[PDB]
Amino acid sequence: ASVYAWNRKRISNCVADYSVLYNSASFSTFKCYGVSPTKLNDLCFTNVYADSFVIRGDEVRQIAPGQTGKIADYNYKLPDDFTGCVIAWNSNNLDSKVGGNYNYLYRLFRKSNLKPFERDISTEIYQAGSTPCNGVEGFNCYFPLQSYGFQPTNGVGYQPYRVVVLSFELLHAPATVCGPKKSTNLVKNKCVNFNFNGLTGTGVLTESNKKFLPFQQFGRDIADTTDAVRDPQTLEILDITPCSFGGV
Amino acid sequence: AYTNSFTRGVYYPDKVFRSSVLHSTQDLFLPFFSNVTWFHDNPVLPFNDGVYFASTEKSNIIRGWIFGTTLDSKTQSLLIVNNATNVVIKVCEFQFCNDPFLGVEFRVYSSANNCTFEYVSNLREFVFKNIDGYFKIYSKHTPINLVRDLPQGFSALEPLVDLPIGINITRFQTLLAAAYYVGYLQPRTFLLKYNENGTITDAVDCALDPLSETKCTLKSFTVEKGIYQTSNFRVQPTESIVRFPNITNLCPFGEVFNATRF
Amino acid sequence: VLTQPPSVSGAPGQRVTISCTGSSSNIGAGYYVHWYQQHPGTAPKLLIYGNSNRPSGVPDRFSGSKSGTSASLAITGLQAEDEADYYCQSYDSRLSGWVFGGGTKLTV
Amino acid sequence: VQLVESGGGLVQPGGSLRLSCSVSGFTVSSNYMNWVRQAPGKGLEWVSVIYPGGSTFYPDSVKGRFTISRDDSKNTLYLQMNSLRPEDTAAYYCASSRPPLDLDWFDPWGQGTLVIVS
Ligand SMILES: *[C@@H]1O[C@H](CO)[C@@H](O[C@@H]2O[C@H](CO)[C@@H](O)[C@H](O)[C@H]2NC(C)=O)[C@H](O)[C@H]1NC(C)=O
Ligand SMILES: *[C@@H]1O[C@H](CO)[C@@H](O)[C@H](O)[C@H]1NC(C)=O
Ligand SMILES: *[C@@H]1O[C@H](CO)[C@@H](O)[C@H](O)[C@H]1NC(C)=O
Ligand SMILES: *[C@@H]1O[C@H](CO)[C@@H](O)[C@H](O)[C@H]1NC(C)=O
Ligand SMILES: *[C@@H]1O[C@H](CO)[C@@H](O)[C@H](O)[C@H]1NC(C)=O
Ligand SMILES: *[C@@H]1O[C@H](CO)[C@@H](O)[C@H](O)[C@H]1NC(C)=O
Ligand SMILES: *[C@@H]1O[C@H](CO)[C@@H](O)[C@H](O)[C@H]1NC(C)=O
Ligand SMILES: *[C@@H]1O[C@H](CO)[C@@H](O)[C@H](O)[C@H]1NC(C)=O
Numbered sequence: 063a064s065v066y067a068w069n070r071k072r073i074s075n076c077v078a079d080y081s082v083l084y085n086s087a088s089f090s091t092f093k094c095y096g097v098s099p100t101k102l103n104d105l106c107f108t109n110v111y112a113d114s115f116v117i118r119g120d121e122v123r124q125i126a127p128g129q130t131g132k133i134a135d136y137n138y139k140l141p142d143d144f145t146g147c148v149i150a151w152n153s154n155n156l157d158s159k160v161g162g163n164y165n166y167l168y169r170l171f172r173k174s175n176l177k178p179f180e181r182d183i184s185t186e187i188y189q190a191g192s193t194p195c196n197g198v199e200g201f202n203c204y205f206p207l208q209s210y211g212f213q214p215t216n217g218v219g220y221q222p223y224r225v226v227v228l229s230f231e232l233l234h235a236p237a238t239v240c241g242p243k244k245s246t247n248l249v250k251n252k253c254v255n256f257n258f259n260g261l262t263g264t265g266v267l268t269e270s271n272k273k274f275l276p277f278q279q280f281g282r283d284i285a286d287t288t289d290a291v292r293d294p295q296t297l298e299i300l301d302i303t304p305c306s307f308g309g310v
Numbered sequence: 311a312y313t314n315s316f317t318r319g320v321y322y323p324d325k326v327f328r329s330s331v332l333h334s335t336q337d338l339f340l341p342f343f344s345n346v347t348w349f350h351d352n353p354v355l356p357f358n359d360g361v362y363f364a365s366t367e368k369s370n371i372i373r374g375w376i377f378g379t380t381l382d383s384k385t386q387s388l389l390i391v392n393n394a395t396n397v398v399i400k401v402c403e404f405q406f407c408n409d410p411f412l413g414v415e416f417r418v419y420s421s422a423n424n425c426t427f428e429y430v431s432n433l434r435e436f437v438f439k440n441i442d443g444y445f446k447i448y449s450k451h452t453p454i455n456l457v458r459d460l461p462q463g464f465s466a467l468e469p470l471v472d473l474p475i476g477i478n479i480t481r482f483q484t485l486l487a488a489a490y491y492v493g494y495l496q497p498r499t500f501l502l503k504y505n506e507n508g509t510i511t512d513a514v515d516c517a518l519d520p521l522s523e524t525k526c527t528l529k530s531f532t533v534e535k536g537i538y539q540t541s542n543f544r545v546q547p548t549e550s551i552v553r554f555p556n557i558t559n560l561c562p563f564g565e566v567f568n569a570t571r572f
Numbered sequence: 573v574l575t576q577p578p579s580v581s582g583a584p585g586q587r588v589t590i591s592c593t594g595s596s597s598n599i600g601a602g603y604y605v606h607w608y609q610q611h612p613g614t615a616p617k618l619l620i621y622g623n624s625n626r627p628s629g630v631p632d633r634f635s636g637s638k639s640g641t642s643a644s645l646a647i648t649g650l651q652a653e654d655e656a657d658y659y660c661q662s663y664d665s666r667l668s669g670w671v672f673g674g675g676t677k678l679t680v
Numbered sequence: 681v682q683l684v685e686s687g688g689g690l691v692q693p694g695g696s697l698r699l700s701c702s703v704s705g706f707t708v709s710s711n712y713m714n715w716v717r718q719a720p721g722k723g724l725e726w727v728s729v730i731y732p733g734g735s736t737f738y739p740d741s742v743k744g745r746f747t748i749s750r751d752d753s754k755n756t757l758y759l760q761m762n763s764l765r766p767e768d769t770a771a772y773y774c775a776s777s778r779p780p781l782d783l784d785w786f787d788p789w790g791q792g793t794l795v796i797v798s
Contacts, residue, residue, distance in 0.1 A: 075427065075474070120597065120666050130735035131668055132712060164781040173710055175733035190777070191681075191706045192755065201681055202706040204779065211781040217599020219666055236443045236474030274327050275508050277469055281327035290327065573723070604785050615773065615792035616724065627787060628780040659723065661786065669739040670714060670786040672723040 065115035065225075066137045066169035066207060067183045073110035073228075075238040078103075083149065090223070091122050094147035097230065102147070103241030109231035110146075110239045111179070113138070116157065116166050118210070119219045122150050125227060137169045141178035145232075150225035154214070157222035163212035166222065171206040179229070245295065253305040258291045263302070267291075270299035311348040313460055315340060315493055319362050320500070320513050321437050321448040321467035328504040332529055335502065338439055338495035342515035346493035352411070354381070357482045360439035360495035366432070366454055367488045374412060374485025377438065377445075379478050381406050386426065388445065388477055389418060391485070401427040401475050412487045427475050437467055438479070439495065445473045460491065466502075466510035501526055574601065574643075576660060576674030582650060583680060589635070589646035590676050596662030600638020606670065607636060607645045610657040619658070620645070645676075655680040681705025683775045683790030687759060690796045696762030699793055700751070701774035707755035711777055714786055715748040715759060717741045719770035726786075727772075730757075741770075748774070759793065769797040 063069035080102040083089070097105055117125060117133060124134040127144045134140075157163050171188045184206075187195045191202025199205065212222050248267070255264050261280055270290055272281060281290030281299075290301050319340025340346075340362045355361075357377065365372050378387030383405035391398050391412070402425040410418050433454040439446050448467035455461065484490065503512040516526040523540040524533050574594015582588055594601060605623035610616035621627040623636035623643060633647035633654055647654045658676035663669045687699020701708075701715075710732045718724035728748035729737035736748055745768065747760035759772055772793035778784030 072426075120602075120663070120668070130731060130733075130737065132731070135731050135733035135735050162781045170712070171710065171732065175735075188710075190711055204711075204777075208779075208784065209781050211603070211783065217597070217602060219597045219663075220599045220602050233476075234443075235476045238474050272327075272329075273507065275468075277322075277325055278327040278508060279325045281329070281508075284331045602783070604783050606786050608789070616718075616789050618787050618789065621778070621785070621787045622783040625782060661724070664726075664739050667739055668729065668737065670716075670726050670729075671740060672716075672718075672725060675723050 063114060064167045065117050065133060066167055067181065068113050068115040068138055070179070070181070071112045071114070073112055073239055074108075078110065078239050078241050080241050089149045089151050091125075091148060091150040091225070093126060095127060096143075096145040097147065099147065105230070106237045106240040107230045108233040108235035108237045108239075111229035111231060113179075113227040113229060115225055115227075116153065116222050117150070117168075117225055119152075119221060119223055122223060122225065125150065125225055132170050133168055135175045136172040137176070139176040139178060139180070140227075144178070144229065146228045146230040148225065148227045150223050152218075152221065153224040154218075154221035156224070158212045158214045158216065160214060163222070164209040166212060167207050167209045169206060170208045171204055248293065248300075256291075256302075259294055261288055261291055263288065265305055266303040267300045268303060270301040272299050272301070274299055311350075312345050313348050313491065315342070315344040315346045315491075316460060316462045317342050317464050317513065317515075318364070318435065318460060319344075319437070319467075319493065319495075320464070320502070320510060322469060322510065323502075325469060327508045329508060330506050331504050332531060333502050333504065334499060334526065334529060336497065336499040339498055339500055339515075340437075340493050340495055341498065342513075342518050344493055346491050348489065348491055350489045352484045352486055354481055354483045355492060357438075357479050358494050359497065360437060361482060362493040362495065363436045363438070363484075363490060364460070365434055365488065365490040367434075367490075368432075369488065371488040372484060372486045372490055374418075375438070376406065376410060376418075376483040376485060377477070377479040378482070379480045381481065381483070383421065383423070386475075386477055388473075388475065388479070389422070391416070391418070396430060399427070399429045399471070399473065400425060401473075401477060410483065410485060412485055414487050418485065427473065429471070429473065431471075433461070435465075435467055437495070438482070440477055440479045443474060443476045445471075445475055445477060445479070447471050447473075464510075464512060499526065501529065501531070503531055573671065574660060574662065574673035576658075576676050578674070578677070580658070580676055580678035581680065584650040584652060584654065586650055587648060588650050588654075589644055590658050590678060591642065591644050592660045592673055592676070593642040594660070594662065594673050595641040596671075596673070597666045598641060600640065600643055601660070601662035603638060604662050604670075605636065605638055605643050605645070606659075606661040608659045608661075610659055612657060616657075616659055619656075654678065681777075683788075685759065685772055685774060685790055685793035688772055688793030688795040690798075691764075693766060693798050695764065697760070697764070697795070699759040699761065699772065699795075701757035701759045701772070701790065701793070702754075703756055703775075703790070706777055708750045708757045709752050709755070713748065713750070713757070713774070714776045715746070716773045717746075717768070717770040718773060722770065724773055761795075764797055766798075769795075771795060 125148045127142045188206035195203035283289045323335050338359045373392045389400050402422045404419040405421040406419050435450045437448040447470045450465050450467050499516045501514045505511045514522050514525045524538050527540045576592045607620045608616040609619040620634045620636045626634045631653050635646035637644045660673040664671035682704035684702045713730035715728040716724040717727045725741035727742035727746050730748040745763050750757040775788045775790040778787045
């Protein structure tokens with residue numbers, strides 16, 4: 063979408079594989095605000111909003127909290143406390159046309175600045191002066207939007223770049239979007255420090271001969287002590303035996 | 311119309327395996343022998359702590375529910391439609407009909423904007439409760455051998471889904487294309503009897519009578535011969551009495567406001 | 573500041589141009605070379621905007637082309653309309669400055 | 681449209697000027713505005729860049745000294761220079777309405793304000 067009319071996609075109830083985006087070299091800008099770019103997988107949020115737009119090279123610096131300019135103030139404004147990472151890459155060989163690619167537009171003239179994540183898509187001819195335009199362009203009557211002359215012969219500062227901003231929103235909600243989870247090899251007949259989903263402790267795990275119901279994740283004994291767990295991956299039932307100890 | 315709920319409405323409090331143990335837990339449950347309404351229509355009904363639903367349809371006429379608060383597109387509401395082999399769970403700003411129904415065609419809402427969540431996966435019993443943002447649904451499908459009754463048997467409802475949707479459910483309405491029952495859950499403590507295979511085979515409603523109360527104190531399903539202390543009687547206050555002295559020595563306000571000279 | 577020639581001299585009638593070499597963020601000054609025909613003693617008057625483009629009222633002389641870190645502000649048919657001071661501008665480094673080059677006082 | 685600058689002239693060293701940049705036709709409140717200074721024999725550098733939303737950018741010429749503004753009621757801009765450095769001896773320019781696939785950057789210029797600042 064055009065930067066003046068950015069396409070907001072809500073990401074929820076899914077596994078956010080941030081390691082691919084971080085590890086790859088396809089992006090030229092990767093500015094993370096409020097999160098650590100190498101710890102992003104461990105941060106769970108209620109909503110993730112993917113703001114997709116194209117800006118010019120010189121304006122990539124403007125896709126940040128606190129920036130100003132024709133785009134930052136009249137097209138796509140970010141809040142000072144924006145949380146998320148801004149990812150952008152050079153798209154010169156994708157959007158530019160020999161005769162100039164003018165299909166990408168941005169808003170240049172507006173009565174006031176946008177609110178965070180405000181999408182103003184009005185096409186009313188902007189009245190800059192005091193004379194009503196009444197649908198006629200002229201003195202003090204300027205169209206509020208203007209197109210970009212994207213061409214393959216333009217310098218880098220005028221080449222198109224594709225920018226994707228992943229906005230991280232945490233609401234009073236379960237927080238359904240998280241990164242991939244770590245898993246390790248199962249160790250049997252030895253004392254290990256284990257963590258099965260949310261069940262943690264120390265003990266010896268052996269093959270179980272117990273039969274759990276299809277919806278039961280772990281077993282607990284008469285003293286509220288965990289004595290069996292279901293393996294989250296292979297649906298094996300494992301008994302937890304406390305590590306041998308005693309007086310000497 | 312009303313009927314006797316008997317011992318129906320128990321569900322597995324959590325996803326925990328327990329073997330040959332009596333577990334004491336307090337949660338929202340359908341009271342044993344509660345007074346439950348027998349429906350043969352579909353008005354909007356209030357939703358308090360949770361709702362118990364059961365139906366005895368052979369033609370599968372009743373196949374949906376509406377849950378929410380405003381139910382008029384002002385707030386989010388949950389729409390569930392179970393057709394054939396595909397059940398759709400959707401939370402959106404639905405604009406519902408003033409008398410919603412399904413045909414035998416879909417005329418439930420006229421618009422369903424700003425959708426936030428979607429998931430697809432005889433005697434039928436369900437429990438619907440929204441706790442801390444999770445909408446928990448339990449169900450059981452069993453044989454039925456009565457024509458106009460609620461068999462006096464026992465089954466525990468199993469967890470089906472736990473939708474992580476921040477929905478406030480205070481009223482609800484059923485969706486139909488038959489008879490069904492609606493009851494309400496209360497915060498009582500139950501003693502659940504687990505078998506060696508992790509299922510619930512019996513239960514005691516701890517508030518049903520002094521004998522059931524005794525069972526909870528001993529945490530036994532069998533009460534032995536003897537005398538047991540089970541509760542604590544307290545007379546409650548019936549009024550609120552506040553007393554202060556006679557109001558005397560009033561301030562000479564009359565001497566200022568009704569003064570002969572200002 | 574882009575390197576602009578100090579001055580341009582000639583009599584009218586010979587085809588001429590005012591080349592202006594300046595990276596100005598590259599892109600031929602971002603096709604953003606604001607060429608202005610500033611009259612001597614009067615405030616600058618823009619001649620051609622969007623160097624390749626001719627703004628309203630631009631003379632038949634008006635022309636403009638930018639290559640790499642260089643530009644070619646051309647006036648065709650040298651006539652009395654050309655004798656003026658010329659100024660070119662572009663964003664400072666890579667900003668939205670509209671900074672100005674060396675300035676070209678074209679004197680006949 | 682007509683943009684007539686006022687307030688320029690001779691002011692003693694070190695002071696501040698509340699000059700005004702009148703504009704006709706286009707009420708000067710909501711167009712991307714720029715203000716520049718250009719001394720004799722010198723070039724025009726963007727002293728300030730008054731974004732129509734309100735943001736102001738003073739890239740090179742002005743340094744904490746000059747404030748670009750507009751009087752909303754009269755549709756005429758105001759050109760504040762205050763705490764002018766001995767380096768501020770120059771003239772003013774305050775017009776930005778680009779157009780009449782394009783660039784449209786800093787097209788017009790008004791009558792200008794000429795100031796002698798010793
Ligand atoms: C001044 O006098 C008036 C009436 O003469 C008082 O108004 C009366 O107040 C008494 C309470 O003390 C009421 O019982 C009467 O019914 C009121 N009557 C009227 C006509 O208002 C007024 O309260 C006096 N001032 C003060 C300070 O008590
Ligand atoms: C987990 O992934 C493995 C990969 O081989 C697959 O064998 C296993 O069935 C998956 N687990 C579940 C619960 O589907
Ligand atoms: C239901 O309530 C009515 C009066 O409110 C009572 O007479 C009736 O016995 C109740 N039903 C049961 C099963 O107790
Ligand atoms: C049930 O409804 C959903 C959407 O309302 C639809 O996609 C699905 O195909 C329907 N079921 C069948 C069996 O067609
Ligand atoms: C869409 O839903 C969000 C919350 O999920 C709410 O903030 C927003 O106002 C809704 N949009 C409309 C038009 O109601
Ligand atoms: C529930 O309703 C209260 C007011 O009725 C509101 O403040 C709260 O945010 C709502 N929460 C959800 C999850 O619906
Ligand atoms: C419990 O499960 C075992 C399967 O190992 C089965 O043989 C036994 O009959 C079951 N008992 C009950 C009461 O379901
Ligand atoms: C208050 O009034 C009652 C009569 O209503 C009187 O008997 C009592 O003595 C009074 N209290 C005092 C402190 O005089």
